[PDB]
Structure formats: C-alpha cells, structure tokens
Design a binder for this molecule. Structure first.
Ligand SMILES: [Zn+2]
Length: 272
C-alpha cells in the first residue's frame, strides 16, 4: 500500500521523507556521516532495490555504483535523477565531468524536491496532491533558509571570505553565497593526500588569508589538524559536506545541516 522508496544517500533521504510523509516507506543506502564517493554496495542494498517502486539518486556521477547495483538487483523501480533541471557546474580538473555537489546551494535543493514530488506523482497518482503540498510547504522553508544564508554572508567584510575544508565539495555554496573554499582533496575523496602538496595548499592559504580550517563529518581529521598547525590557523569545527549527522548530531536534516554550516562559517570569518 505505501510507496517503497529507496534513496541513495542521507541528504536526499531527508528530502524524500519531507515530500512523502506517511505515504512512503523509506530506505537510504549510504547513511549519516558516510561517504558516497567510495561506497561499495552491499548485498543488503540489492535486496532493498529489488522491492523499491522508486529509486532517488543525485546523478552527476556522484553514485559510481548505482548502475551495477541496479542490474544486480533486477529491480523494476523507476529511477529519478534529482539533479534534472539544475544548473550544474563542471568539475575543475577533468574531464567534462560535472561537480555533483549541487545541494550546497539552496536553490538547487528546491529542484531536487520538485523532482521527488514528480517521481512520487508518477508512481502514485492518488497521492500526488499530498506530495505536492508537502513539497511546497518544505520549499517555503528552503526559501527562508536561502534568504538567511545570503544575508548573513553578504554582511561580512568583503576581505575575509575564505575557509579551508577537507575536499572540494562546496563550489556550489561558493557560487551561490560568496565564500571561497580551499581543500587538500578534489571533488572526489577517491584519491589521497599528496602530502607532497600541503605546502601548495598552505601557500594558497597565506595568499588568500584563509580564516580557518574545518574538518568534515565524512572524513578523517589528521591532515586537517596538521594543516591547521602549519598554517597557524584555528581548527574551527566540523562542516557537513556529503552527509547528514546522525540524530543527536547537529545536522540530522538538510535544513539544520545548512544552518550549522553557514553559522559555523560566518562565526569563523568574523573571528579574524
Ligand atoms: Zn564530495
């Protein structure tokens, strides 16, 4: 009777719970504090897909395992790519690959949400008015959030807008909001460290007068702690990049995740 939905990872799982309410049964593959770039699907994940009516995915090559997992599971679920209709950004490096981290700009989260609603509308026409009224309610909360983030940032001094994080995961926040981010890893956490290039990072840190270093919830902290040491900059806290916190963390849903991040960034930038 309820719609069987599978979401690839936590951030889009939260969006699904918002649009779908009581009418869906939700399963999430990659969970809180876990990293989708390196996730290897387990056999339990194939069982989940096999029963789904709807599978929700970021797309943009975020989930390198999906298409395999789809064929292994034999699922007939319809698959919705929630970045459909988002203004995407190309990866810096490559490779006409796209940067998958589109949810870091709240306007794009509105789109993910619209696509969830459409997907549920296609699978359960009887529920469609309810899916859309949930989406519209939530989209109103996202619009207020967007306003608050832009406002807080645009206030801050033009000359102190840079922070250091773990991977290159906030380019859409930069584009929406005007905060510049450096990191030792690229767009994906698949690679390494090339501690052979912290001295490169550090030099860019000095040239840009970066205000602070942040850990990320998906990643181990040691290099960040060391970069902090060598740059003489505080380790200011933890940002939530590609996953929610668990419950009882400060980022257990998307809106809370963004308010945390934006508040932590602003405090650090204003510290100087
Ligand atoms: Zn990432």
């Amino acid at each position: 009777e309820p719609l069987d939905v599978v979401a690839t990872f936590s951030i889009i799982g939260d969006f699904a719970a918002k649009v779908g309410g009581d009418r869906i049964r939700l399963n999430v593959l990659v969970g809180p504090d876990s990293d989708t770039h390196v996730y290897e699907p387990r056999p339990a994940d194939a069982i989940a897909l096999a029963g789904a009516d709807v599978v929700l995915t970021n797309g943009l090559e975020f989930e390198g395992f999906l298409t395999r997992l789809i064929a292994a599971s034999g699922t007939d679920a319809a698959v919705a790519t929630l970045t459909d209709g988002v203004e995407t950004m190309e990866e810096p490096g490559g490779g006409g690959a796209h940067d998958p981290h589109a949810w870091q700009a709240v306007p794009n989260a509105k789109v993910y949400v619209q696509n969830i609603a459409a997907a549920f509308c296609a699978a359960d026409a009887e529920g469609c008015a309810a899916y859309q009224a949930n989406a519209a309610r939530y989209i109103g909360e996202l619009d207020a959030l967007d306003t608050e983030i832009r406002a807080a940032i645009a206030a801050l001094p033009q000359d102190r807008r840079t922070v250091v994080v773990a991977h290159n995961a906030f380019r859409y926040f930069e584009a929406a909001y005007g905060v510049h981010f450096l990191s030792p890893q690229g767009v994906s956490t698949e690679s390494e460290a090339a501690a052979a290039d912290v001295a490169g990072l550090i030099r860019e840190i000095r040239a840009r007068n970066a205000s602070a270093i942040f850990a990320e919830n998906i990643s181990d902290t040691r290099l960040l702690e060391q970069i902090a040491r060598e740059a003489g900059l505080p380790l200011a806290g933890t940002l939530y990049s590609d996953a929610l916190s668990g419950p009882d963390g400060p980022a257990s849903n998307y809106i809370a995740m963004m308010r945390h991040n934006a508040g932590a960034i602003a405090a650090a930038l204003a510290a100087r």
